[PDB]
Design a binder for this molecule. Structure first.
Ligand SMILES: [K+]
Length: 228
RNA sequence: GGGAGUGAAGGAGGCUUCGGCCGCGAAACUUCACUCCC
């Protein structure tokens, strides 16, 4: 694909035949994140599973040791004293079904959204099609839906991430910012990798982490050894 | 070796001959995968 000079340059910096260590990679990050903003670091792993087999779906969440160095605007749809509990946990905008029409008018000033199970009827059906493209819709297996809404909200704002393999058997997640210190990123990179392994399916066949990579928003990639 | 599509992820910037072009919509761009084609 037609690349820019900025990127053609980044290519000369990494060796595609070399399997870098989690730490070597963590040091390249700075030298690759040359876009005109604080690029995000990410890890991509091709998983030894059968995406078609519902029970071999790698899906979960995990807390990162050094956050995502990113501010997360969480919205909280709720019912009862739960509202008070959400406001307490630290959500940016708390509310009830009313939020539903507010969003149907064009309000998308949030990054995340959580909700108590008892509002999901209205939230599910109504906000379903408008929130669906951005992957904003609250879900139980996503960790976005729970009565312990303050704990869920507390967690997100602390740099907790989600991860679900895609239909091709690959899984991806952000693990920090290019501004992070080399080793902080590394702690974060091992964290996510360990999260994946603790979610290896029972009937999963063969080598689980077939490959694992490190990259930034606009830079190239470097294959790493998951156990470094 | 190159041209593309599809999925997921990251993403508010990306490219430029400096004329502007593209993107902040799912959409630019980039990554890992699933295919098509030359
Ligand atoms: K990328």
């Amino acid at each position: 694909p037609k690349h820019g000079k900025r990127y053609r340059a980044l290519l000369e910096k990494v060796d595609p035949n070399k399997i870098y260590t989690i730490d070597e990679a963590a040091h390249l990050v700075k030298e690759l994140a040359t876009a005109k903003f604080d690029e995000t670091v990410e890890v991509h792993a091709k998983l030894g599973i059968d995406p078609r087999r519902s029970d071999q779906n790698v899906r979960g969440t995990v807390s990162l040791p050094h956050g995502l160095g990113k501010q997360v605007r969480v919205l909280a749809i709720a019912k009862g004293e739960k509202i008070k509990e959400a406001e307490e946990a630290g959500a940016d905008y708390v509310g009830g079904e009313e939020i539903i029409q507010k969003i149907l008018d064009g309000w998308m000033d949030f990054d995340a959204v959580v909700a108590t199970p008892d509002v999901m009827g209205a939230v599910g059906s109504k906000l379903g099609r408008i929130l669906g493209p951005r992957g904003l819709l609250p879900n139980p297996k996503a960790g976005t839906v729970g009565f312990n809404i303050g704990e869920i909200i507390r967690e997100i704002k602390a740099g907790r991430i989600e991860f679900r393999n895609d239909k091709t058997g690959a899984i991806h997640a952000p693990v920090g910012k290019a501004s992070f210190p080399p080793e902080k990123l590394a702690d974060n990179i091992r964290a996510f990798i360990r999260a994946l392994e603790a979610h290896k399916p029972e009937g999963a066949k063969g080598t689980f982490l077939r490959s694992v990579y490190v990259t930034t928003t606009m830079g190239p990639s470097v294959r790493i050894n998951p156990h470094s």
